[PDB]
Amino acid sequence: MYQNFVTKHDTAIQTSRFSVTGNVIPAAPTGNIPVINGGSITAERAVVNLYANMNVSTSSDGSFIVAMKVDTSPTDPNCVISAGVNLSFAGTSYPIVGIVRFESASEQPTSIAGSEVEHYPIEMSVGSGGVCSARDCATVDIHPRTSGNNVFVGVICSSAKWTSGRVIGTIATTQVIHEYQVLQPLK
Amino acid sequence: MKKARRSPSRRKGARLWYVGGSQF
């Protein structure tokens, strides 16, 4: 059959990678959501590899974020932002994902107040008790709303009731300002 | 490729079909 060359999300190639380990302390939206990145990539091409331990020290329910900085060069008002996630959790917690947008004068935000995060729901492929998967995108205004901030985008992972345990997977995300050229046998 | 779409008329020659009378 004919090969399908269009996709909702195209993972970065050979670049913008980082591995996250150790503990990850999810938090409630009333507090400050953990941005498990200090080495926050940003060609808004990001591939974060997870091999950490989901730890419930703070709240038993909440969420954490994997973010990447948006390129604000484009004169276009807003562009598409796709993400691709695959996470297996040792402890049944029924993960849930989505795209988010938040600004910060800081270059490497370690956390962001829940009240400052904007949400964008996405087609979630799977949502079993132990694994969440999704590959989708959403439209997001890319210019800084408050003169002087940096614009961040990324996927957030939440749960109604987390369970201490290991988590493993990949959180990829990209702002589309380039479509990767590809060999199409019939052209 | 004008005629090729339409089956000929067989108008040349004599009468072939006797069917009892006029039939459209």
């Binding site: 380039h178 050229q181 590809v182 060999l183 199409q184 046998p185 052209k187 | -």
Partner: protein, 422 residues
Amino acid sequence: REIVDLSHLAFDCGMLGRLKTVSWTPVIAGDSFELDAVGALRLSPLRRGLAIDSKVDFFTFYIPHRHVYGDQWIQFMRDGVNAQPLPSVTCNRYPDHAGYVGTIVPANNRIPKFLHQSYLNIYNNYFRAPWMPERTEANPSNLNEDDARYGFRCCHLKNIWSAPLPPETKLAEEMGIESNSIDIMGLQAAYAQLHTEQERTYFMQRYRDVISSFGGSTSYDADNRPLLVMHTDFWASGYDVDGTDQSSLGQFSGRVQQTFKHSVPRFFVPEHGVMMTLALIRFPPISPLEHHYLAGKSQLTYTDLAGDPALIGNLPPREISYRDLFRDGRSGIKIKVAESIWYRTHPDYVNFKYHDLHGFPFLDDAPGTSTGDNLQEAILVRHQDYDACFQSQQLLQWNKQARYNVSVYRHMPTVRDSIMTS
């Protein structure tokens, strides 16, 4: 002295900057060879609409086998039916690794020397910068992947940064002098001598050109140069295809498709040899990164701006670097240009915006940006520089198909005569 019909089709394709053979025909002493080729040339699908047309060049050279095999050939022909067979040269064990000389690598992995050597001779006598190292690979197997399959690389179209005075151009000529005096007569000679040196460096680096200098001439046998029989050139234009579905509506894809004729007038073949015809597709080196020389100078001096003739005709060449011409220009690449040359020609302009839009055949990176502080490597066209703007090189970057009508008068017994004994 009867007719032999050698007409035939040819489907080919190649990389941009590289010179490829598209059709070769062996000829014999006494032959009258005529060739009228006609076809169309295309480029792989473009990412965006059409921007600029590529310039195509077709050549047809004649090369005496003697030029290839040397004295060994003379003996061959002399000894006639007793001659020790001519040697073949080797190719790498891959089908395509003979592409530069327009042929698939035969079953035995070796091709006739005249193909290989001619290609070389052609390249060394007309395509490379006269100052660049003479190309001297001994066997097609000594060639590297890219070269062997797509042909050698040639020089970018001429411009201020790709046509600098040969790198070894004198910037000052010293003349010794006794501790307290100077021989004004010697000084006079000194200049004269210099003049001969310059003329040579600037335009008489080839023997043949020096002899022309004297108002003399040289046969093509004198320096073993392939004989250029016909040179054609044309622009490759095409059309855009309109996108019509929900998301593609308002999008365009450039399909370049140009028809062309390349005709060689009846030519007389004095000795056995080959008639090779090659093509070369190039894109004028436009770049959103290049700027006017004067825009880049930090301290504008009278000598730069004024354009005072008195100065322009008596100053020495000027050494500058690519950094002085492109924003991301490499400072390690030095070139020697002629004073106030920037006042003799204007450069093309591309708003820095196109700088990162894939689909335009512009050099989105200062020439030589990924080859290192090496001039030759910057001047020679790097075909990868274009990979960016093609939807997919299923047929390399360009490709074409044409009919080569060849008629050759020659002494040739009829097939009937060959197969019949009595």
